[PDB]
Amino acid sequence: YDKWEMERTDITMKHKLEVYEGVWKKYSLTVAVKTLMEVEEFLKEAAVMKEIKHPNLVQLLGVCTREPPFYIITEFMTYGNLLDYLRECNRQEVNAVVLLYMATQISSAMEYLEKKNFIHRDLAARNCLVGENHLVKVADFGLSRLMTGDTYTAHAGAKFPIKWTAPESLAYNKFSIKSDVWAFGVLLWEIATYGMSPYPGIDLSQVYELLEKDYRMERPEGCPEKVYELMRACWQWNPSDRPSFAEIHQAFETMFQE
Numbered sequence: 125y126d127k128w129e130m131e132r133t134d135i136t137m138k139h140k141l142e143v144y145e146g147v148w149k150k151y152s153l154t155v156a157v158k159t160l161m162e163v164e165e166f167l168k169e170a171a172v173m174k175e176i177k178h179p180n181l182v183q184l185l186g187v188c189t190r191e192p193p194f195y196i197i198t199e200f201m202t203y204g205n206l207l208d209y210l211r212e213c214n215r216q217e218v219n220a221v222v223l224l225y226m227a228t229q230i231s232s233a234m235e236y237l238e239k240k241n242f243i244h245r246d247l248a249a250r251n252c253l254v255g256e257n258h259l260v261k262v263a264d265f266g267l268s269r270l271m272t273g274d275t276y277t278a279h280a281g282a283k284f285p286i287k288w289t290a291p292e293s294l295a296y297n298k299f300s301i302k303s304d305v306w307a308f309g310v311l312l313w314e315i316a317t318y319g320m321s322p323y324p325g326i327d328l329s330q331v332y333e334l335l336e337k338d339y340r341m342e343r344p345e346g347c348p349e350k351v352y353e354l355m356r357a358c359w360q361w362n363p364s365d366r367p368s369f370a371e372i373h374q375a376f377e378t379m380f381q382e
């Protein structure tokens with residue numbers, strides 16, 4: 125854990141994006157810096173990121189956890205968040221096969237988290253980052269430890285991103301890897317629509333009531349049928365009926381390789 129420990133003066137802040145674009149001076153490397161949510165939570169978040177090693181999860185580079193202010197230093201993704209990237213892109217370049225490639229990368233990251241007993245709890249396009257050549261990485265700053273068979277119960281009075289949130293979470297504050305699968309389905313929809321807002325115009329207070337009566341978003345324009353079938357599978361009411369990320373990733377790698 126001290127192999128990760130850095131001196132605060134090894135980094136220089138360049139631009140404020142509390143997240144900064146910074147420079148790891150020794151390597152002349154552009155990095156992302158997060159500074160200090162309570163202290164212990166921040167330190168645990170750093171501790172968890174030390175255990176994460178995957179090409180499509182944002183890589184930790186070092187921490188400053190001796191004397192305040194505390195730093196978490198990670199790799200820098202050139203193009204920023206996926207949501208704005210999709211909304212502002214050239215769709216002739218970011219075409220159908222690129223969208224499949226992005227979904228494959230994200231599902232690969234989630235398959236890793238699934239295998240390593242982590243949940244994300246805020247899977248969404250706004251929380252994915254884009255590098256050169258349509259490289260996509262999931263932000264892993266809010267990861268929680270959880271055995272995949274088990275359930276996390278959010279604290280009393282927690283506020284959710286309703287339109288990304290699984291029904292069991294909206295009603296009972298319960299989260300699991302299956303609730304991430306639901307969120308992934310919404311992320312797929314975001315990708316397929318190049319960053320449209322989910323359930324357009326639908327009042328937030330009626331989303332749960334709609335879901336329990338089996339309302340789901342319709343197939344986006346131009347979206348392949350098999351991709352929509354995957355979305356719908358992710359949106360099964362019963363969590364145990366939803367596919368695993370291993371199955372989801374396998375499905376996308378097949379599509380992408382064909």
Ligand SMILES: COc1ccc(O)cc1-c1c[nH]c2ncc(-c3cncc(C(=O)N(C)C)c3)cc12
Nearest residue numbers: 141143156157158182198199200201204205253
């Ligand atoms: C300390 O790392 C983090 C902690 C919090 C957070 O939200 C993200 C990062 C993070 C890591 N690597 C990154 N690489 C690139 C960018 C980034 C660059 N430029 C623009 C945007 C952006 O979309 N907006 C400002 C809306 C994001 C962020 C990051």
